[PDB]
Amino acid sequence: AVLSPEQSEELHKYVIDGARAFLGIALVAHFLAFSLTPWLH
């Protein structure tokens, strides 16, 4: 069900930390793609 304003902010910290973890892994994968692939080369 929909949350209290405080419970919503507590849940959204896990969503934002999950998106930051995904972003970091994607930044390493894009650097590996720049180094190992003819992309941007």
Binding site: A1, H12, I16, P38
Partner: protein, 48 residues
Amino acid sequence: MNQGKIWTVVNPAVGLPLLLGSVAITALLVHLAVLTHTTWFPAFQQGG
């Protein structure tokens, strides 16, 4: 990160599966698009 009130309006039991499923579908579509429009990704799959 300033959008944290959205779970007062959207049910997180529907919206969090929709978010994770949309991200996973998007990653498959990008991989398929790169596979179909380059020669180097099929050549990496082929080897030899």
